[PDB]
Design a protein around this nucleic acid. Structure first.
Lengths: 260, 262
RNA sequence: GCCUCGUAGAGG
RNA sequence: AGCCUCGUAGAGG
């Protein structure tokens, strides 16, 4: 209903989108604004957006699979409307139209789709360790004093957690109070460590108009704090990843993380 | 001269804790010949050497054969060792339950690629770099302990920590240490201008070293300086070069941190 | 993830 | 398009 969700769309068309990540971004806003141009404009401007847009990796040429997550309540409905209204004439990526061959909103329909209530997410079993699968290049913006554009394309436990928290606070109905948030970032930069990782890989990808370095693979974060407040906070964020994504550029295909 | 010698030891059975036993032999031998050295070294918190049992395109090892890579960081350390080693050899070189047999002393880059000798001045005069690639041949880890007696390891190629370590070493052993200001200038630049440019064949490991088990990574990692400061570009050159002799990170005396500049 | 140095990186 | 906006560490197009 007004729950976070993930859906996957097969866009079967004649040729591969020249810039799937980018064109998918356009398709989204074009769609979303057919219905409500205020939502489009206001959303567009937001520094923190409650949605992700990711061409899934690894299909046939001419076909594209888009994962769309949403955190807001008012985002899904207009999209659904535009989609239903849009679908019959095909959805346009760039200068071609693709046929909505499939819509996979069911967990059983695709392992990367489904929904959950904020209450479920929030009542996630507490964790002392959390593994993530980063399916598409994941990068953090680690900028510095001066005009210093800098990137961290590796699974820094602090930054991972940092994003999932920043994201939670921004888009969650049950946000922590400043004290708790402070006592979380603290317990993170104190008791978080890299328990391990599999199939790490470094990439340079066009995330929209530009190219960014990112990593993929799996990483396990461990938390030495027995402090129960921090433990179940990890549980919440670990679940949230499935919908919020991780780090920077989630609207452009990057940061597709998945809780293991 | 910081030298790097590979030692082939032949024995009955592959050693139980090679890195720990090797560590013991180094001092035992160093102590019999130069028993004041052994004491001083063991005291220092940054020892001017590395000891690492080697681990690809050299095919199958024979059961019982072992390779020790010894790198010395000051001109004093290597000379006696050989001498000590040499004398103890005919007897049988013992690490653990069993004695092994010195079969080769490979101290020339032509005998083993990880072997060789370079001059402090040569390192110093290493061409400046905008990018530095390293190949970590053995699990490499950093100690990033936090307040309150918390022990934390970062088994990742943190460009800060990779460079930071190499410097910290350069400062400890080199006859040409940066001054307290030249130094802190680099450290600020290193946090500010150092990025990860790429990496290859990264892999997590959990290994035995010292009195403990530690995590650590292996593979390649290209660093990149986004600054234009020649102070730093050259520093990168010096540090990139010393990696061959100094290692990178914690537990280099116990087999971790075998870094190699490509 | 034991001991030691003290804050963050290290030594056995 | 290591470019633009935000200005301190992380983000948005």
């Amino acid at each position: 209903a007004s729950m976070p969700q993930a859906v996957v769309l097969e866009l079967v068309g004649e040729k591969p989108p020249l810039y799937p990540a980018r064109y998918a971004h356009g398709l989204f806003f074009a769609l979303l604004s057919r219905v409500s141009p205020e939502l489009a404009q206001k959303l567009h401007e937001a520094p923190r957006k409650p949605f992700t847009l990711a061409p899934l990796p690894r299909t046939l040429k001419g076909t594209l699979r888009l994962r769309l997550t949403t955190l807001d309540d008012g985002l899904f409905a207009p999209f659904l409307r535009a989609l239903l209204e849009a679908a019959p004439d095909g959805l346009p990526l760039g200068d071609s139209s693709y046929r909505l061959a499939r819509v996979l909103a069911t967990r059983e329909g695709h392992p990367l789709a489904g929904a959950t209530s904020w209450e479920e997410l929030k009542e996630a079993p507490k964790r002392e360790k959390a593994t993530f699968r980063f399916l598409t290049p994941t990068v953090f913006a680690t900028s510095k004093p001066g005009g210093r554009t800098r990137y961290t394309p590796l699974p820094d436990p602090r930054l991972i957690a940092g994003s999932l928290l920043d994201k939670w606070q921004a888009h969650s109905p049950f946000p922590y109070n400043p004290k708790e948030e402070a006592a979380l970032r603290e317990l993170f930069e104190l008791d978080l460590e890299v328990a391990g990782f599999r199939n790490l890989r470094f990439h340079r990808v066009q995330a929209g108009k530009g190219f960014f370095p990112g990593f993929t693979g799996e990483a396990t974060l461990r938390l030495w704090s027995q402090s129960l407040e921090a433990q179940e906070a990890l549980g919440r964020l670990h679940a949230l990843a499935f919908f919020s994504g991780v780090g920077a550029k989630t609207p452009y295909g990057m940061g597709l993380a998945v809780p293991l």
